């Protein structure tokens, strides 16, 4: 229909502006479908070397990463696919990722057994809380909301208590603990 363009624009914009954080590889695959959309079917003679301005095709954190090559592989791989469906495979691919429609906060964790803070993406959905790598965007751990028993925000931190689901609270340094808590408190009220 026409919805598919509105949806495409929205999924696409979220990845470009960083609201939907994705791995480099996926960024590129997305860029591949965006090329198919904006440029039609790939052509090795036109779609060349400095043909793309990467700042309109990748999230800011990946522009200086030298991605043209693999954006072009993902573009080639589309072939004579049409805008309409290229747009749909993008929206499908986005939907396919565990990061899709998660609210994310950049926090800091203390490494277990070490006096060292690491940056970390903490994500909150409907269903779960998840720890995600700042660089790779790997989902390194998830907890169901149903396993969260208590929580507390301060102006400097946020802390979860999973009760007898695991040993140890999970706790992060953040200036956004209140928002994080309101998100989670909302979702858990809703599950009733």
């Amino acid at each position: 229909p026409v919805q598919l363009n509105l949806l495409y624009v929205q999924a696409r914009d979220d990845i470009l502006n960083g609201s939907h954080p994705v791995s480099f590889d996926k960024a590129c695959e997305f860029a591949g479908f965006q090329c198919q959309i904006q440029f039609g079917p790939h052509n090795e003679q036109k779609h060349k070397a400095g043909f793309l301005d990467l700042k309109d095709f990748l999230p800011k954190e990946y522009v200086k990463q030298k991605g043209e090559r693999k954006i072009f592989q993902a573009h080639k791989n589309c072939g004579q696919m049409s805008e309409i469906e290229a747009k749909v495979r993008y929206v499908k691919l986005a939907r396919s990722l565990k990061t899709y429609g998660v609210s994310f906060f950049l926090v800091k964790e203390k490494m277990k057994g070490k006096n060292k803070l690491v940056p970390r993406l903490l994500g909150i959905t409907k269903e779960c809380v998840m720890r995600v790598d700042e660089k790779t965007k790997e989902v390194i751990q998830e907890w169901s909301l149903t396993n969260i028993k208590r929580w507390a925000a301060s102006p400097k931190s946020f802390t979860l208590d999973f009760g007898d689901y695991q040993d140890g609270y999970y706790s992060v340094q953040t200036t956004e603990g209140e928002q994080i808590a309101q998100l989670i408190a909302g979702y858990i009220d809703i599950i009733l």
Binding site: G113, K114, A152
Partner: protein
Amino acid sequence: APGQLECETAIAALNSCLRDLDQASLAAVSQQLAPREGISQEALHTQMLTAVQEISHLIEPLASAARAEASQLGHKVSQMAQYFEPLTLAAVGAASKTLSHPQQMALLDQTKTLAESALQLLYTAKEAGGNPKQAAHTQEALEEAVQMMTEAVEDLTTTLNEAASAAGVV
């Protein structure tokens, strides 16, 4: 189940010390850690220094027992665990009597780190059991756990001195 029950209990007790440390931090981070009365800063720091030194002296012997002697491992882990209850109590009291909030948090955090490293030592030591036929993956993990505890002891110790100096504790 030779030395293995001692590991389980030891591990459970460290898990418990760590929850007390997270409560103190939570309370602390929101400026509601009431200073503990009935006891001097001197005696708390003395409690903390002692327990740390004894934990430190126990790391290699524990590690070595895990590479060979199942019976001995069971005794060394329970030894190592006994020290953590008093350390945790002392650390929460000391922190509560510390005036500078950053220094109060550093005591708690570094004590947490040490308990965490102890926990990992215990996991890898329990996996090793007495049995020397453990894999080199168990060997490398244990040596790492040991190295991690040693650095934790180093860090907390320094932080102990600094806090001591701020509080005139001698």
